[PDB]
Swiss-Prot record, chain A:
A GO term for molecular function: FK506 binding
Family (UniProt): Belongs to the FKBP-type PPIase family. FKBP1 subfamily.
UniProt domain PPIase FKBP-type: residue ranges: 19-107
Description of how the protein assembles with itself and partners: Identified in a complex composed of RYR2, FKBP1B, PKA catalytic subunit, PRKAR2A, AKAP6, and the protein phosphatases PP2A and PP1. Interacts directly with RYR2.
Subcellular location: Cytoplasm; Sarcoplasmic reticulum
Provenance organism: Homo sapiens
Residues in the signal sequence: none
Protein name, entry field: Peptidyl-prolyl cis-trans isomerase FKBP1B
A single Gene Ontology CC term: sarcoplasmic reticulum membrane
UniProtKB/Swiss-Prot annotation, chain C:
Role: Cytosolic calcium-activated calcium channel that mediates the release of Ca(2+) from the sarcoplasmic reticulum into the cytosol and thereby plays a key role in triggering muscle contraction following depolarization of T-tubules. Repeated very high-level exercise increases the open probability of the channel and leads to Ca(2+) leaking into the cytoplasm. Can also mediate the release of Ca(2+) from intracellular stores in neurons, and may thereby promote prolonged Ca(2+) signaling in the brain. Required for normal embryonic development of muscle fibers and skeletal muscle.
Note: Binding of [3H]ryanodine indicates that the heterozygous channel is activated by Ca(2+) concentrations 4-fold lower than normal. Single-cell analysis of cotransfected cells shows a significantly increased resting cytoplasmic Ca(2+) level and a significantly reduced luminal Ca(2+) level.
Source domain of life: Eukaryota
Name assigned to this protein: Ryanodine receptor 1
Domain B30.2/SPRY: 1-168
Region of interest: Interaction with FKBP1A: 40-51
Subcellular localization: Sarcoplasmic reticulum membrane
Record annotation: effect of changing G345S: Decreases protein stability
Phylogenetic placement of the source organism: Eukaryota, Metazoa, Chordata, Craniata, Vertebrata
Source organism of the structure: Oryctolagus cuniculus (Rabbit)
PTM info: The N-terminus is blocked. Channel activity is modulated by phosphorylation.
Ranges for the Sequence repeats: 274-350
Subunit structure comment from the entry: Homotetramer. Can also form heterotetramers with RYR2. Identified in a complex composed of RYR1, PDE4D, PKA, FKBP1A and protein phosphatase 1 (PP1). Repeated very high-level exercise decreases interaction with PDE4D and protein phosphatase 1 (PP1). Interacts with CALM; CALM with bound calcium inhibits the RYR1 channel activity. Interacts with S100A1. Interacts with FKBP1A; this stabilizes the closed conformation of the channel. Interacts with CACNA1S; interaction with CACNA1S is important for activation of the RYR1 channel. Interacts with CACNB1.
Amino acid sequence: GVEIETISPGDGRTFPKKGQTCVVHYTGMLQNGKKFDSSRDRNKPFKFRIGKQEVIKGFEEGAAQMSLGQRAKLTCTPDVAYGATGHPGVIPPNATLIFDVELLNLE
Amino acid sequence: DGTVDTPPCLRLAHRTWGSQNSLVEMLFLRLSLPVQFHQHFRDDPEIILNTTTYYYSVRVFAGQEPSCVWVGWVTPDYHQHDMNFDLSKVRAVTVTMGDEQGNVHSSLKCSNCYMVWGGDFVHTDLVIGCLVDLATGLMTFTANGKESNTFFQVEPNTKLFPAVFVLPTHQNVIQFELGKQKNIMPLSAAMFLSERKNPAPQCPPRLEVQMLMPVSWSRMPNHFLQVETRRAGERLGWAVQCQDPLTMMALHIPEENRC
Amino acid sequence: LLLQTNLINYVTSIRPNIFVGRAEGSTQYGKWYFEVMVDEVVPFLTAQATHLRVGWALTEGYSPYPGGGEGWGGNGVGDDLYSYGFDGLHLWTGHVARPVTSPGQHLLAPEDVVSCCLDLSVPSISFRINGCPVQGVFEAFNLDGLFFPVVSFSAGVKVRFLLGGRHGEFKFLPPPGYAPCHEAVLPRERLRLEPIKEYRREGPRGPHLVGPSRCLSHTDFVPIVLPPHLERIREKLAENIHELWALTRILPEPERNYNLQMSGETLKTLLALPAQTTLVDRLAENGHNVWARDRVAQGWSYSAVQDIPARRNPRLVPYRLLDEATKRSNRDSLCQAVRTLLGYGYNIEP
């Protein structure tokens, strides 16, 4: 269940394809609103190649749905992201996550 | 302390009601911890375990006029400290959402103060109870064993604190009776995570009455944001621009939304 | 359980000195329109998102103190239920985001103009972005206090106010029945932009500490026997007022009678109730209040530019909010009345 609220309009010229690395600055928060992770604080773009299982399924699906230069409100169900088991100390069990991603470039 | 025939309770007594020196000013009460609804929603042992409805009762002591006692729930974002307070004076707003054709598909109302007037309901003490269901998203107000027509619906995720606004009218003013209805899990179960499935009503030391102080101290920020303003356009109107960024590091109390 | 820690960005709210409020007798139109365009906004200057919000706020409850405030901090216009606003994608009131569908469906961007539409008689606020209305509108807000436009920028923006119709050309034509913002400027002071409740103000020699700002509420806009010897004094004052009318031409008996009919209001005010100057000023204030009440009964409401079909009047304001010129004219008329009373030889106790 990826319902992307288009925060900023995307270019629409290109979309992610298998074998291409994706560059994002994903800001994350829980359903209650508290922030758990913000790559922006690290100040380093997160790089991952689409197609493999490097990232969670929900993030990959949202990136595939998203376009270059588009900011979207990424909502993930507990089934697609973590679930009954999660990262100990960070993500509570069976809790939804609300990601905020934006694609600087697609490579 | 909890009695055999009476659940544990907190009572408020005026120290010097008889003395003329003591003031009779307006005062507000707010319990220490909140009650939180689920992020998303739809005496018998089974019903009790699955019950999503909680109950607290407040007993107005004899000799206190019910007209001055306002009982209900309070949103944490509450800052009204009016000397003379009325439910009509409560700030409220209704948000209506429609489609392109103008059809109203969703309509919601949100306010920072959800209470009913004691005088609106009505020399014997009357107990005013509030039934809240977490999974229902709405609450029912049953006072003195009789249900009331008025009721409210809340947002999916919001915080709510028990609260009563009472004007001093007697030496013994009011009582917070934390008790559970036969089929209603007591407020203590939803109050703490550990006692979620505990039917027995308990009053841990954390819960306490927090009155509304009018003025509290605060620290001035060392550097403020620089903002410039001028009427830069004869037809472009006034313009404002800020360039220097500034950030501040703060802590969040999870019990009450504050920084 | 533990105290979560994170850094945020500072927020500051600015408003014009315009005040708009509804009351039983207040001379307010009840419907206003203004537009704001964004020249340039940086999407991200700091780790946290820069938020831009445009809306209205109460003059009695809006307290956006720079700091933690409520919620997570960075309290904007919609942080408290006192004030209202939106960020361009979500309506904001009471620190909750309301997802409202918009045809553009994007945040505030450079070269984008946003506008507001609110009614005071019917409690509803609507907005228009890029000339198109928002799907969802506000409703059922409290009418207590006075409203004003306000914007809450987050640490960086290039935005210009186009609320002033005479001060700035409107980007879009206002909807019918909505007066321009600049039409509600108070005659006492010129339009300017000042921060709300700014307790510190920067100074040349050093920072200047500012106390609690005092502002007028909606109550500010809110507006029996004739003795026979007093009737003889009124005839003498009728002769004096015929002389006054002759002076105003720049003493016929019918002219004196017409002047007495005109001054019957002042005669009734005197019958109802240095020291002479103070009494004259009080009588002039009461007369101006009666004139304002009569205008309100005629449906008149104050505006910057007076229109006869719209019943707008430059003096459709209380005596306290009235200009100094009208007060001086009333004082001169009351001084003429005091001279007539001194000539009559009977003086009331002040």
